[PDB]
Design a binder for this molecule. Structure first.
Ligand SMILES: Nc1ncnc2c1ncn2[C@@H]1O[C@H](COP(=O)(O)OP(=O)(O)O)[C@@H](O)[C@H]1O
Ligand SMILES: [Mg+2]
Length: 133
């Protein structure tokens, strides 16, 4: 896993995507809103993003994955959405270290963690992290 070090979350995501795009058959796109993410939660969100992308590339057999990062004042929203085959989260969740670790990173930063994956809907991961105005 890449590490952010000096970079903002947005910059880390964009740089990772640049590298991935050269190697992978899925189209990987980002929609990153320009706003300051609190330094304290950036690493956690980057670790979630990397796992979500990894799972999409390996497991979805889709053609496109989108990473979105939006500011909604009281919270930020991180969404990773693919158009692939989907899976049953319940069947996998408790035996799955990747999913369990994303959920734990979210908890550590006080954020919700949701996975919506249905046969015709692909897989969508959403994390809403609180922001203090
Ligand atoms: N985006 C996705 N599309 C389809 N299947 C997925 C996706 N993400 C996870 N899965 C399924 O959930 C399982 C558990 O995910 P994870 O805990 O990350 O395990 P892995 O080590 O296999 O990446 C995967 O093996 C795969 O079957
Ligand atoms: Mg995984």
């Amino acid at each position: 896993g890449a590490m952010l070090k000096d970079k903002s979350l947005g910059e880390g995501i964009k740089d990772l995507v640049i590298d991935l795009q050269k190697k992978v058959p899925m189209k990987v796109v980002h929609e990153i809103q320009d706003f300051k993410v609190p330094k304290g939660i950036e690493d956690h969100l980057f670790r979630i993003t990397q796992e979500a992308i990894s799972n999409t590339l390996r497991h979805s057999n889709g053609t496109k994955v989108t990473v979105e990062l939006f500011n909604k004042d009281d919270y930020l929203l991180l969404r990773i959405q693919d158009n692939g085959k989907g899976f049953n989260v319940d069947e996998k969740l408790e035996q799955s270290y990747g999913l369990k670790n994303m959920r734990e990173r979210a908890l550590e930063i006080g954020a919700t963690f949701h996975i919506v994956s249905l046969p015709d809907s692909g897989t969508r991961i959403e994390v809403k992290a609180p922001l203090n105005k």
